């Protein structure tokens, strides 16, 4: 459930990017409150993401080809579906009678994905979902063949639905360059609560602005609440505001007549103590973009496993229990500490 | 020494506006850590009924599995607590969901091609195109019929769209209510927002009679300041009417004549509700959860 | 995809006021400042959600393979 | 006002697709040097 930007250009609609929404609207309090949001890190709300907040998904399809092995004059050897001289159960709980799975059935690693019973070994040798994430099957397509009209299929495509909620580490960005990872899903009860009950959804770091100079975010946040209350959607084309026509003076007549503070500030209170904060908190609505690459395919762990033959040393591969490499300048820092049993 | 029977002589309540969805009431002379703790319960620790478990039988439509499983769970089901008990999910399904913990719901919606004559509206072009969340039907399981003769399960907000369907598509699922609290998942929140604010106090310093009194209205919301003449130069009618704007602290003529600041002991609790329970009783589900969060410390053995 | 059910900040129920919202615009020709206001939305966290909502479910429902053509 | 979201024009365009003319014409002008350079292999003066 993406929204559209309240603060935008007018060379937006003329390309019509409402036919491709990309990002969402976050109530943003520019505040250092947690201590968990430094080195550009930021703090999602819990009950925002439990209500869905950039609730993303993903897809991927997979070719299932028996004809990749099959030669030209090779007869049509192996066939999708089970056979006889067998009965392994619980494959019937993942698959259907043609040896192709029910659409929408929760698969994992170790689980059968299709049953192809050959006739040269007389046993159903199923193949298996070759990844480590909780997937489903979105749709299956039974693909025909070209050079004939009539032979059985040896090509299936199967579409997977990997769900991907915003876990901790999943990177954000607004439209200005203010990227920063989702550091801690703070519970919403202990987030700051404002005058009315308006609790922020992403807490962003004020110690991430003065070395960044992203002041177009300093005005979009006061423009965003100016469009949100009044029900307009303000233009933010570059070079509309001259130096005599300060936008903080432009978006300030709107918020003065609205009832909020002229400078974009809002007096929040404290969600962990109950007393009021000292300052007035800069609160608005900005437009955030949940990025592609996440931490949910980055980390790994290895204690023991596959040695090699030439080396008797462990193995590379994130899908293969990848071994951490202690390398050249890792060798020459253990010496530099003087330790020679953290190197032995 | 501070007696707690002096606390009773310094604790007043002004209920301003009490409605069956919101209540706006005052708490005079209580602490920001006691009145926080009431507000700390009413979001989270109050029990409220929703659905964790969505048993799909059939759904071929566009809105996929886990998504419509999600948006059933966000529906406030008008189910009074204390008419269910707590699940004990340490044991599997055979006795995990009873007839006494779980309220069971079902959805059966099929969309067809409806022939109609003229840009054409989708409610007349199809039969049952929009899955409204008044289509959730309470299945009375077990003995849930001898006592639900005046409290049948209805969803509290019935007109929620859940899905839009095209001909061929159907949705057949089975839903299970679970009794929960708002620390685990947001969907068991018994409230829209149970927040307070604190009573501001506006102190004039220099008398601002005349032209300084008439321009002094427009810095504030209107029903706050009362100016008449030289005599009756200004006063404050009700600062409760006044949200904290601080517009007057933009003006240079008035930036030294006035003092804004809260009265630190007048909590204006305005508790709304999502729809499950009345606000003026979920506050009683926080004056008696606190009282029964102390007994779990007090009547409890101090270990080692 | 469809209107969200609850507001992402406060916790008020939002989804029953989207098709009840276009029936203050296509018919009464109201401005959004009254159209959102006449429904009951009065906190801007739950008032940048019925205003802003893209509602791309309609562009999905045109792609149905459970129907002839 | 300043500018607008079109919350009745998008719903009339999502539900009722344009039978007549492609809306948002600048987008077809952006990709146009690819198509226009490929139209000129078989079409134009001298073929």
């Amino acid at each position: 459930t993406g929204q559209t930007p309240i603060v935008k250009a007018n060379l937006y609609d003329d390309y019509g990017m409402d036919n491709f929404p990309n990002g969402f609207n976050a109530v943003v309090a520019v505040i250092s409150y947690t201590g968990y949001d430094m080195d550009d890190a930021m703090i999602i709300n819990k009950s925002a993401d439990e209500r869905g907040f950039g609730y993303g998904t993903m897809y991927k399809t997979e070719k299932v080809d028996l004809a990749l092995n099959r030669n030209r004059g090779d007869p049509i050897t192996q066939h999708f579906g089970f056979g006889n001289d067998e009965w392994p159960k619980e494959w019937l709980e993942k698959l259907d009678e043609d040896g192709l799975p029910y659409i929408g059935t929760y698969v994992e690693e170790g689980d059968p994905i299709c049953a192809y019973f050959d006739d040269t070994l007389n046993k159903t040798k199923i193949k298996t979902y070759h990844s480590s994430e909780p997937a489903y099957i979105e749709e299956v397509n039974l693909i025909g063949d070209e050079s004939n009209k009539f032979q059985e299929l040896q090509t299936v495509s199967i579409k997977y639905r990997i769900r991907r909620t915003p876990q901790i580490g999943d990177k954000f960005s607004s439209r200005h360059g203010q990227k920063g990872v989702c550091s801690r899903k703070w519970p919403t009860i202990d987030m700051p609560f404002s005058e009315t009950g308006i609790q922020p959804d992403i807490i962003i770091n004020p110690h991430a602005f003065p070395s960044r100079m992203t002041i177009g975010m300093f005005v979009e946040s006061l423009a965003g609440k100016a469009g949100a209350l009044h029900g307009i959607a303000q233009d933010s084309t570059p070079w509309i505001f001259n130096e005599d026509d300060t936008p903080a003076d432009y978006f300030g007549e709107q918020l003065a007549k609205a009832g909020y503070n002229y400078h974009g500030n809002e007096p929040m209170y404290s969600g962990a103590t109950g007393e009021e904060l000292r300052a007035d908190i800069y609160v608005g609505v900005v437009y955030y973009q949940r990025l592609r690459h996440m931490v949910n395919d980055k980390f790994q762990v290895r204690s023991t496993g596959p040695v090699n033959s030439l080396t008797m040393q462990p193995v590379k591969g994130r899908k293969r229990h990848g071994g951490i490499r202690v390398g050249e300048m890792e060798r020459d820092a253990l010496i530099g500490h003087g330790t020679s049993f953290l190197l032995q | 020494e501070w007696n707690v029977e002096k606390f009773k002589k310094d604790f007043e309540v002004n209920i301003s506006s009490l409605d069956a969805r919101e209540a706006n009431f005052d708490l005079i002379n209580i602490d920001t850590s006691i009145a926080n703790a009431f507000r700390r319960i009413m979001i989270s620790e109050v029990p409220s009924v929703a659905a964790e478990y969505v048993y799909f039988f059939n759904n071929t439509s566009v809105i996929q599995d886990e998504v419509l499983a999600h948006r059933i769970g966000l529906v406030p089901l008008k189910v009074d607590p204390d008419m269910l008990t707590w699940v004990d999910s340490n044991l599997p399904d055979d006795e995990k969901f009873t007839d006494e913990n779980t309220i069971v719901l079902s959805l059966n919606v099929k969309c067809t091609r409806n022939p109609d004559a003229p840009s054409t509206d989708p409610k007349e072009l199809y039969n049952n195109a929009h899955v409204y969340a008044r289509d959730l039907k309470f299945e009375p399981q077990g003995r849930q019929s001898t006592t639900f003769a005046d409290c049948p399960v209805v969803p509290a907000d019935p007109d929620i769209l859940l899905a839009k369907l095209r001909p061929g598509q159907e949705i057949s699922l089975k839903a299970h209510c679970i009794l929960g609290i708002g620390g685990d998942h947001a969907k068991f929140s018994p409230v829209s927002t149970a927040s307070y604010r604190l009573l501001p106090q506006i102190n004039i310093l220099q008398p601002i009679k005349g032209e300084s009194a008439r321009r002094f209205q427009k810095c504030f919301p209107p029903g706050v300041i009362g100016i008449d003449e030289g005599s009756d130069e200004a006063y404050v009618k009700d600062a409760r009417k006044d949200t904290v704007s601080r517009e007057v602290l933009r003006y240079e003529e008035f930036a030294d004549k006035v003092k804004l600041g809260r009265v630190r002991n007048h909590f204006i609790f305005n508790v709304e509700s999502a729809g499950a329970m009345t606000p003026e009783e979920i506050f009683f589900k926080s004056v008696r959860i606190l009282k029964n969060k102390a007994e779990y410390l007090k009547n409890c053995p101090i270990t080692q | 995809m469809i209107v969200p059910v609850r507001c992402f900040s406060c916790g008020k129920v939002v989804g029953d006021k989207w098709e009840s919202y276009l029936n203050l615009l296509q018919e009464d020709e109201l401005d959004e400042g009254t159209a959102l206001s006449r429904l009951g939305l009065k906190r801007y966290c739950c008032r940048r959600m019925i205003l802003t909502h893209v509602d791309l479910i309609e562009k999905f429902l045109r792609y149905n393979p459970l129907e002839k053509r | 006002r300043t500018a607008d979201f079109r919350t009745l024009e998008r719903e009339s365009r999502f539900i009722n697709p344009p039978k007549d003319k492609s809306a948002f014409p600048l987008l077809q002008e952006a990709v146009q040097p690819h198509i226009g350079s490929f139209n000129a292999l078989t079409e134009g003066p001298d073929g």
Binding site: T196, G197, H230, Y250 | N24, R240, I268 | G33 | R1, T2
Partner: peptide, 24 residues
């Protein structure tokens, strides 16, 4: 340069929690 146009006809859009629209 014609200014960024001051949009006309805007009202007070936040009030006291329990005091909606009695202000005229």
């Amino acid at each position: 340069r014609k200014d960024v146009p001051k949009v006309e006809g805007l009202k007070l859009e936040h009030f006291a929690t329990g005091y909606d629209a009695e202000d005229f």
